[PDB]
Design an enzyme around this catalytic site. Sequence first.
Site, short mmCIF file in Angstrom:
data_model
loop_
_atom_site.label_atom_id
_atom_site.label_comp_id
_atom_site.label_asym_id
_atom_site.label_seq_id
_atom_site.Cartn_x
_atom_site.Cartn_y
_atom_site.Cartn_z
N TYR A 162 0.82 -1.21 0.00
CA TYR A 162 0.00 0.00 0.00
C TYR A 162 0.86 1.26 0.00
CZ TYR A 162 -3.04 3.83 1.44
OH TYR A 162 -3.72 5.01 1.59
N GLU B 20 -3.74 7.35 -3.79
CA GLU B 20 -3.84 6.00 -3.22
C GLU B 20 -3.59 4.83 -4.18
OE1 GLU B 20 -7.35 3.93 -1.37
OE2 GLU B 20 -6.56 4.87 0.46
#
EC number: 6.2.1.5
Lengths: 385, 385, 286, 286
Positions: free
Chosen positions: B109, B197
Amino acid sequence: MNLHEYQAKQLFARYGLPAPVGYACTTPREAEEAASKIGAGPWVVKCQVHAGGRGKAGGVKVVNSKEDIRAFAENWLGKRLVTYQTDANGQPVNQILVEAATDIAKELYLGAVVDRSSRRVVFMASTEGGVEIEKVAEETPHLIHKVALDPLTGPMPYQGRELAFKLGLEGKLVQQFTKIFMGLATIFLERDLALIEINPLVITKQGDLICLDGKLGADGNALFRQPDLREMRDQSQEDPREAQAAQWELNYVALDGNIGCMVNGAGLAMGTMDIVKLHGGEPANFLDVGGGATKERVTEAFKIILSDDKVKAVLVNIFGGIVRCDLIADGIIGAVAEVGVNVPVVVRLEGNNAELGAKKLADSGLNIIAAKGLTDAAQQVVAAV
Amino acid sequence: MNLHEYQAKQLFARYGLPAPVGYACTTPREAEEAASKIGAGPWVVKCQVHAGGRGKAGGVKVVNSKEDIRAFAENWLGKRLVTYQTDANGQPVNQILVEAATDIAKELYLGAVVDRSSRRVVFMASTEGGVEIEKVAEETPHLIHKVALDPLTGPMPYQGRELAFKLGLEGKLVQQFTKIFMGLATIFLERDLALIEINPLVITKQGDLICLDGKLGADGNALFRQPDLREMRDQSQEDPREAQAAQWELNYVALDGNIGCMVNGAGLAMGTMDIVKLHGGEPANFLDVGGGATKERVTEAFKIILSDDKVKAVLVNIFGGIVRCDLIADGIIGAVAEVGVNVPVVVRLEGNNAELGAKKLADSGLNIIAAKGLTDAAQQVVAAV
Amino acid sequence: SILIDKNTKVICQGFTGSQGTFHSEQAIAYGTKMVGGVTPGKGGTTHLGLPVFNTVREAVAATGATASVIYVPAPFCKDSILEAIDAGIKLIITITEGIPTLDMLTVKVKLDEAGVRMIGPNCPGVITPGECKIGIQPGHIHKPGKVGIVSRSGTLTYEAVKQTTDYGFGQSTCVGIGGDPIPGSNFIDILEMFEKDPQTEAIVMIGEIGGSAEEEAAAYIKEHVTKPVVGYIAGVTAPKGKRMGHAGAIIAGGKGTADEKFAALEAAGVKTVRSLADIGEALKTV
Amino acid sequence: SILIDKNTKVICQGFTGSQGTFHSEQAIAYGTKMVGGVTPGKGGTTHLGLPVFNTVREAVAATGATASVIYVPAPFCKDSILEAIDAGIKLIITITEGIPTLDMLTVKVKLDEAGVRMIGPNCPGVITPGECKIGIQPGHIHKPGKVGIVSRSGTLTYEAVKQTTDYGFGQSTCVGIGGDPIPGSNFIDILEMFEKDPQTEAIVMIGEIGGSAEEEAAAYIKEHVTKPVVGYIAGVTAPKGKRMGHAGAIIAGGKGTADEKFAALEAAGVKTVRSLADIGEALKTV
Ligand SMILES: CC(C)(COP(=O)(O)OP(=O)(O)OC[C@H]1O[C@@H](n2cnc3c(N)ncnc32)[C@H](O)[C@@H]1OP(=O)(O)O)[C@@H](O)C(=O)NCCC(=O)NCCS
Ligand SMILES: CC(C)(COP(=O)(O)OP(=O)(O)OC[C@H]1O[C@@H](n2cnc3c(N)ncnc32)[C@H](O)[C@@H]1OP(=O)(O)O)[C@@H](O)C(=O)NCCC(=O)NCCS
């Protein structure tokens, strides 16, 4: 695909062509704040719609105070503007272009298109700036000069000069014009344009050429390689149903008549509309079924045609195609019962299982009339109304 | 302002970051033709809506044949997709992204946002790829590593390297990650982003880092200097009324209650909604009147609030502002009249001529209740329902 | 009385524009000492009877003002805020709404490093009832007093102003810190100016959803604020992840909800009020 | 019989794709002499029993075909059209819809310069009833005969085909020139092939709005076509300035209306028909 004035102006700026200083605004506050960013007045405020004849409709004005700008913005944002080139609904104004006023000395016309006849990109210049070019071409065809881009060599300066001189420019205006011709010619080739229109291409009192207005058309077939242009599309300017149809591989175009048409094929679609006209009917739309006449696609087409309340009857005309007629008749029925079609539907099938299908339609009980051939089907729908 | 996945992927490509090969399609034909342009299967097909949790909703799939691609496209284009992040209506799917499948070895991530607290742009990495990052941050906060961009120096490679090591990467993966950090950091500062993101940032079986998904948010306040991003906005993903309000300098956000609110001031607007809640009411919307409470602006606000049928009453609460309280009362009447408001309108005025205006409202002979103070007005509307 | 007073000499940047002109007459008429303004290219002229300069420095020389009020459109605000910091203005009040978050992030770092003070941006301003008014707020609803107010919302301030004028208390100085994500002064900076202000007997602290400035001030209040503090948080009924008008008003990643803010103000022992109607009422209890 | 016949050996570019595969089986079953196909990267394999090559040149060597049918998506069509021209294919039939106008403009120039013939793009194809089929048209509605047909529309062709099969006339060869703005062969190129064809006794010329290919042919017909010509123009009820399905079907600058075309076909003494229903009927008059 069309672009807004402000979008064309941005494009010109990228290629170094001259346009007035301006700002595209979405709120009256933006509009009024543009004033001081531009400088001293007065300023030009223009509604941004794809159609032309915005001037006449009162969508373009020169104002003197920040308040007047706010006022214009308040008056138009969110409203639809009807010009002689828009249908009766007009197009929605969602942006106001606010630019610096220009001291106009002389108004010219510069434009380019693909000449189907000579199979070339042709540029046209005229001294008749500020007039719809089709008038000029009909009345004074000798006042329009043209050059054609040679696909082998690309735009050349001599062609730029040629036009420049035929317009009677001289001095630095000859250089300026040449450079603008070269720019536009390049933009044209590089962005896959279909049409360019600078009307008017102005000579300022201070002696420079500047593009006051701008009108671009891009070739839809080329968007796959024009990512930026793809993003600039403004669906708000089109009949929403057209896009909706496209998602379903249907080509739709609304008209004013009461007889809907669902045909497969652009030619057959135009033919069907005509033969219905011939026999006193009034075609209400053009709809070409691109995909296979599957149940889902046929249903969709019905939804779209019937979105218009003027429709009193629907003529389906399907010749061959990659779906057996009996399956098509099946889909037509589901469509009718599921969409809840009220008006009478006349159907003309032709090809594999045409007769088996026409029976299925007739036994269905619904208000479906299986026609025996083109002319009959024509008369039938015209009659149904 | 949000961007689509395909849009963020284009941006990454521009800055040389790695993303899978793919094509954004607007018709099932484009979708199916993407197949062979990409190569051998299988392929990933993804609906393009601003919201997340598209997977769960069945808006993302891996397929094996061209037919399957066509089928997916036909099933979704034109439909609304509802995920746990969209309201009950969901968002319209107008494009399918079709990209090559990726051999996933590990899922990470990577993300960035403006940390209000430390007043910095903070980047976060974690080995918990493929999970909503807010879960990870609540359950195992020590699993998320951060760095903050120094506004004096800009992003530096040691910061990229640190995160790379804390994630336990080594070898060429350290380099790749550093480069990605440097790219994203740059794009962030250059395009005035609000949020980034990459979930998941994948390590492929062949040993490379690649951005499988992408989610960008741009700072709307900066669009005046981000012309390309401005063009990328997709209004179709938002409540149309929000945009409509913005044209009129009103901030609208729809809720589910039956008491509409028209207040001037973001804080007073949120306060009003709360005090109505306190007294048993259910606020139906937030609406902040930005401009002067002019007749035209007040009329518009009514049209928007009432566009929702759940509305049973309307609470207007106007404190001060740049318009005389008696002129506001005038406009409120002219609004109720032109709009044709069926429900009872409770009004609380305060400031110059508040006394005079409340009388005008009461003498009008319309369903207008002039309240004597905040709490009364609150009770009044709650009561009216 | 904090930040400003009858003695503060003020110049206005963007002085010859719409808002600048208007809100200056209002400050003039209220008696604020407006010594002049700046608008590049209009230096050497008068407007509203004051002198107009081309640069913030020329103004600071010719008048010796020490505070500047900014009414300059977002696109040029960072430039103008930084020029003022440069010409030595020690107090900056920025009304402007719409400044890019990233500009403020940089401007903030400069402000702190150069020791300058900025209230804003995207705020109503600051007023010391009776002595000084810099901003857009309506002067006739305040009255010289003992309650100090800090608020992220301007209009919410007017409610509280009104209540404390009616209950007779009056206000020392009213501070609108602005609705942006990264303001130049937060709660703790203004809270601490009050704690040390004799004229301020109690404090009304108004916040809303988003961010953690409230929470952080709470913790600070508990440990360093002695005077009585009554707070109100707007936005209980607010949906998650949606800007509510103010750029800074948004619940992100589930953080910054109206309730956690109340909860934490209470832990620090603050008189929380669930209805902005009873702000005056709670002050009667001190 | 013009263009193709029982002896024409054909290869298909885009042979292993959806449409390519399908429409090739239809051609193979009709008896067309498919000798093989091209799909870069699949050279050295068989598909529908024929050999598949990596490049058009390898195919031309190994089979000696002289015509190529293209079922390659728009984005790569220009490259494949030029590849064929360059491997020496003398007849090119392009089905592909959506080729950028500017690509055709360049391709056309090269076609004419290199002496190659291309029917299309965006067309049904070409058929010689009984002998050869290259395209998507349904083979069982035609019958060996004496009427030749050129059309911008494919489906409109099938109406005329059907009528002439029923009135017993039959067709020599049916040519779909395509619905794009700049095709590789226009009316006059095909008209002239018929005039010199013994098997063709009369001609059915079908057009639609947009462009001036009809008009130009009219003028040519008058002066060089001796055989009887019956023409039909679709699009009388069409609105101005809107693409009607076909990229080339649009009335631009008020030019290319259904009516001017009729008018000019009549001047050249052509049997115009206002209803596509009576195409057969008008041929009975010759
Ligand atoms: C800043 C704001 C008030 C400006 O609005 P405005 O007055 O209508 O804008 P105008 O164009 O009329 O005036 C701006 C002036 O600044 C001037 N200016 C521009 N750059 C400048 C600079 N660097 N330094 C000084 N002046 C400058 C402009 O020249 C203009 O003056 P001019 O018109 O005489 O040339 C407005 O953009 C804004 O942010 N409004 C929201 C305020 C708000 O509602 N706040 C929250 C309260 S809770
Ligand atoms: C060309 C068209 C038919 C292709 O559709 P399609 O058959 O579904 O396309 P596919 O992807 O299935 O196949 C295309 C093939 O071309 C191949 N190809 C691509 N570029 C090529 C080239 N330069 N040379 C050779 N083959 C090529 C691809 O590899 C693919 O085959 P593969 O699947 O074995 O890899 C379609 O784009 C089209 O244009 N349709 C409209 C047809 C029409 O209606 N015409 C008018 C009639 S009136």
